[PDB]
Amino acid sequence: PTINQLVRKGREKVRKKSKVPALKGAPFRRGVCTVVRTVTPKKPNSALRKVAKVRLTSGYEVTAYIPGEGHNLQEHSVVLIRGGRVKDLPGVRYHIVRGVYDAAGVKDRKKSRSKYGTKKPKEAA
Amino acid sequence: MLTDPIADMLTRIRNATRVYKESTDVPASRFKEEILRILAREGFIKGYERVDVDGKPYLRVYLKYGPRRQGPDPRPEQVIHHIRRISKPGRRVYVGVKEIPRVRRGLGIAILSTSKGVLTDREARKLGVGGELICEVW
RNA sequence: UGUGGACCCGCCCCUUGGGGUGUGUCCAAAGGGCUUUGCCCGCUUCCGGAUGGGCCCGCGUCCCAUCAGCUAGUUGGUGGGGUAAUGGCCCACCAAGGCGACGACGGGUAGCCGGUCUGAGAGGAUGGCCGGCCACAGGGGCACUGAGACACGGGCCCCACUCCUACGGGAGGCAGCAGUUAGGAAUCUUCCGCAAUGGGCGCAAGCCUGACGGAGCGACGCCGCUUGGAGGAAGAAGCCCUUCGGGGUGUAAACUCCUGAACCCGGGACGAAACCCCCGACGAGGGGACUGACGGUACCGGGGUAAUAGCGCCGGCCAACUCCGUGCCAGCAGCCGCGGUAAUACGGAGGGCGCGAGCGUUACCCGGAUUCACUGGGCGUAAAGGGCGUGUAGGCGGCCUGGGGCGUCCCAUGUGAAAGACCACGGCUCAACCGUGGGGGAGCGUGGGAUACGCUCAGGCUAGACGGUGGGAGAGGGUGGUGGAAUUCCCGGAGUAGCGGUGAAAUGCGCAGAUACCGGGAGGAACGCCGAUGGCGAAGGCAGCCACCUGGUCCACCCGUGACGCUGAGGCGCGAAAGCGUGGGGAGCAAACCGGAUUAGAUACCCGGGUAGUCCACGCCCUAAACGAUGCGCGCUAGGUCUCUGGGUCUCCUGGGGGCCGAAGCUAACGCGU
RNA sequence: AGGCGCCGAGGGUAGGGCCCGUGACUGGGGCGAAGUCGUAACAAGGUAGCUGUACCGGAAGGUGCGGCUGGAUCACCUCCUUUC
RNA sequence: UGAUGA
RNA sequence: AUUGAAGAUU
Ligand SMILES: NC[C@@H]1O[C@H](O[C@H]2[C@@H](O)[C@H](O[C@@H]3[C@@H](O)[C@H](N)C[C@H](N)[C@H]3O[C@H]3O[C@H](CO)[C@@H](O)[C@H](O)[C@H]3N)O[C@@H]2CO)[C@H](N)[C@@H](O)[C@@H]1O
Ligand SMILES: [Mg+2]
Ligand SMILES: [Mg+2]
Ligand SMILES: [Mg+2]
Ligand SMILES: [Mg+2]
């Protein structure tokens, strides 16, 4: 644009949008479950994926992924939510933190133990 | 109407050299002359002189090149590699002495107009004055 | 009493209510202690200082124009009132004004800054701790007192809440330190001390001080430190790989010596010398004493134990590979993507990479992102030229000379607090942290200077633009008129059995005689050949011929004016087709629709009919593959060839259009290319 | 002292404008390996396509009018290129 | 006139 | 049963 033009209109600040209304910015939100459905992925993916409908302290009600081997969640389960889409499941944009509230940690977990929320086990250790 | 005469000159010059012309008229103005003097002195042009064409004052500018050149494409190097307007009617550009640019670590010039007259950048810097930054040239 | 000060009037200097002066008028005071006639603490008037503040002004300060008009104390005035003081701050009266595309008004969001984070920088983001300013003290009013408040722990009233109530009435306000509860992903002790610093009152001794100086909780952050050091096999076991030879964990362990975090014993701070008292003189100066929350802590000396490792990752980006399990499952997943019976990508295991009292995850900010491009981007086909003009504001402006000096540039000077930042040297054993010193600095104010460029004023020129005279080409537009070819119908003639239509057919029309043929008539619409690779117009668009009304434009002459220029937000006008309204018209064509075929079906392609519409006048609509998908103007940069239209000295030369090929150059390419 | 008055937080009734809520009924839209109907489009896509508009039809669409090439194939042409 | 997902 | 594996097919 001419320079007069920039004096007239100026450039416009590219201000862009959140991917995670875990509202008040907040790094995590507390919710209570509602469904604990299973969902089919899309794309070229086939499987039965674990999901909860979560009613939030945000005021918001949304779907969240339940990561790891197997869970222990049902209707009234009460859980912490973290954000992290699933990407195979369009419309799933939050994960459930495992090992907080009524969500068990992953039993029998040796490797990426810190996610999945499972304490240092004792064997020869 | 022709809206930036000094742009014009720089361009006439830029244009004539890329087809290796020996010379170009440009319609004459005192200011244009002052810029030419620098070009001449700094060794970018051979020289220049006043002349008429259709009986109106012009300025023949004698341009200057390198030697005929090595292999496929024998075109001489240019002496005036780059000649660019900085200040323009759209956007006037002025510098204080502390902020006059250094063109191509000194291997280049920046003509620049002051209330002590038109000067290369070293010239201006020495007489510790700034002004309208006319064009760079390297 | 009147040093003096206040006020009215005058006069002088000075210049907004600043000094000075003269009548007149008006206005002061408080006592206390004593080491008691002479000192200490006070009181009163006034002039100054110092510090702290009020008020005003230039400039700067976020998002939305899908917020465009706003405003009655409104804008100004005269006279009051009110204040410490200016002011519609408030009031009476008069005037009719003020503000806004340079964004008024309205909506949203927000305490501002010093700074902070990020970035090469320009910039972006931000304003927690610390320092400065502002505003608020349950929400809303309001004044009192005072040098100062319209007062967080003062007052009054209204409201909402909680508490007491003998039901009339009352009490109250942690956004002070702790602490409780609620909300939340989440944020501390109902600690110790006035020892230091600082504050209030007091002559002092002192008292008050949840300011503060410390300690406590939390890996929340930064910095320092430990979980050992040297030996120690061709190399235990176990575990893992294995072409069954072996290879790996691995000097790692074991084991030898050595040192000695922790822990124990002994000593033990600086931070604190003042106030005060004595001497001197209640001064200067000298002497003396009291005082430590932190704390039996830091630090010093002695003794002394081998004494904690975790988390993430190993398909590519990205450093790190193997065996099982699993079979599009269970699962992974920042993006690309892994898994369907041989998975370095899932889960486990060996081994490996990375970091280490941490490591990862999520959220958020800057980066990379020249991905809003000022630095530093683009629009023929990628997203992007406005459908075209006209011209308003605005932006931009040829050549010469002079004034001015606004922009711009230079010198001096003031300002830019401290913290922070950067550099030095210092103190804690280092560092973090801290002290001291030095050096930057835009922006703004003042004084002086320059004048090239920009601006402005005044003059001047003719190269831009406009005009004059003379010539030209054109489907440029408007109005009236007229011409022939064809189709349809109507009338007459002659004439007989089909015509029409298709891939083939049928619907249809024909003996009320159609088709074909000849003559006459009516009507509507469109203009064959010329016709072009042609012309005209800003676009849409414009085509028989004739007249009239009218737009643009090209050439020659070099005659006039003297920069009168370019572009153009908004406005206004034009704008193909189809469509809308009113009134006409209606030949041919033809959405819809009615039939005939076709087809698996055929709401279609083909065939026979047919209304709107196509046509005219007037008024709307305002769209498009409104295209060169290429905004407008000007200057510059090889040529060749075809063409329309001028001029010349007419091989040619020279203008203005239309084309193609293509120097230089440009482009992602295709292409573009006077 | 007390009284009256102006102003005045706030409240009321009428009248507009505006924001949140919820909402019976209702319109589409995005996304989801292997459901149904046809076959519009891409080759001349088997009626060249696209387009503004207008009517119509389960659906893609079809047709009318005008426009565009951002259309295949054959011709006559003239341009370019080619010489010569 | 049609030719199921990777 | 079929397929690389599935959907679909008996
Ligand atoms: N997507 C917007 C419009 O949506 C429509 O798409 C929607 C449906 O029409 C389309 O349906 C397809 C169907 O076309 C196709 N012929 C058969 C197929 N099973 C369907 O599939 C759809 O529905 C199935 C459930 O059966 C889901 O598995 C699948 O995610 C989805 N693609 O799937 C879309 C919903 O996913 C148009 N077909 C689409 O082309 C158009 O763009
Ligand atoms: Mg770009
Ligand atoms: Mg485009
Ligand atoms: Mg297929
Ligand atoms: Mg698959």
UniProtKB/Swiss-Prot annotation, chain A:
Keywords, ordered alphabetically:
Methylation, Ribonucleoprotein, Ribosomal protein, RNA-binding, rRNA-binding, tRNA-binding
Q: Where is the composition biased (Basic residues)?
A: 108-119
- Gene Ontology MF annotations: rRNA binding; structural constituent of ribosome; tRNA binding
Regions annotated as coiled coil: none
Looking at the record, which segments are called Disordered?
A: 105-125
Superkingdom of this protein's organism: Bacteria
What biological processes does GO assign it?
A: translation
Q: Cite the post-translational modification comment.
A: The methythiolated Asp-88 contacts a modifed residue of the 16S rRNA close to the decoding center, and might be important for decoding center assembly.
Q: Which family does it belong to?
A: Belongs to the universal ribosomal protein uS12 family.
Family annotation (NCBIfam families): rpsL_bact
Q: What is known about its subunit structure?
A: Part of the 30S ribosomal subunit. Contacts proteins S8 and S17. Interacts with IF1 in the 30S initiation complex.
According to its UniProt entry, what is the function of this protein? With S4 and S5 plays an important role in translational accuracy.
Q: What is this protein called?
A: Small ribosomal subunit protein uS12
UniProtKB/Swiss-Prot annotation, chain B:
Keyword list, A-Z: Ribonucleoprotein, Ribosomal protein, RNA-binding, rRNA-binding
The entry's cellular-component GO terms read: ribonucleoprotein complex; ribosome
Q: Is Lyase a UniProt keyword of this protein? A: no
- Give one Pfam family, short name only: Ribosomal_S8
Q: Please name the GO terms of the biological process aspect recorded for this protein, alphabetically.
A: translation
Instruction: Select a single GO molecular function from the record's annotations and give it.
Output: rRNA binding
InterPro entries with a match to the protein in the record: Ribosomal_uS8 (IPR000630), Ribosomal_uS8_CS (IPR047863), Ribosomal_uS8_sf (IPR035987)
Does the record carry Ribonucleoprotein as a key word? yes
The entry's function note states: One of the primary rRNA binding proteins, it binds directly to 16S rRNA where it helps nucleate assembly of the platform of the 30S subunit central domain. The combined cluster of proteins S8, S12 and S17 appears to hold together the shoulder and platform of the 30S subunit.
NCBIfam families tied to this protein:
PRK00136.1
Family affiliation: Belongs to the universal ribosomal protein uS8 family.
Q: How does it assemble?
A: Part of the 30S ribosomal subunit. Contacts proteins S2, S5 and S12.
> What is the protein name stated in its UniProt record?
Small ribosomal subunit protein uS8
Can you name the source organism? Thermus thermophilus (strain ATCC 27634 / DSM 579 / HB8)
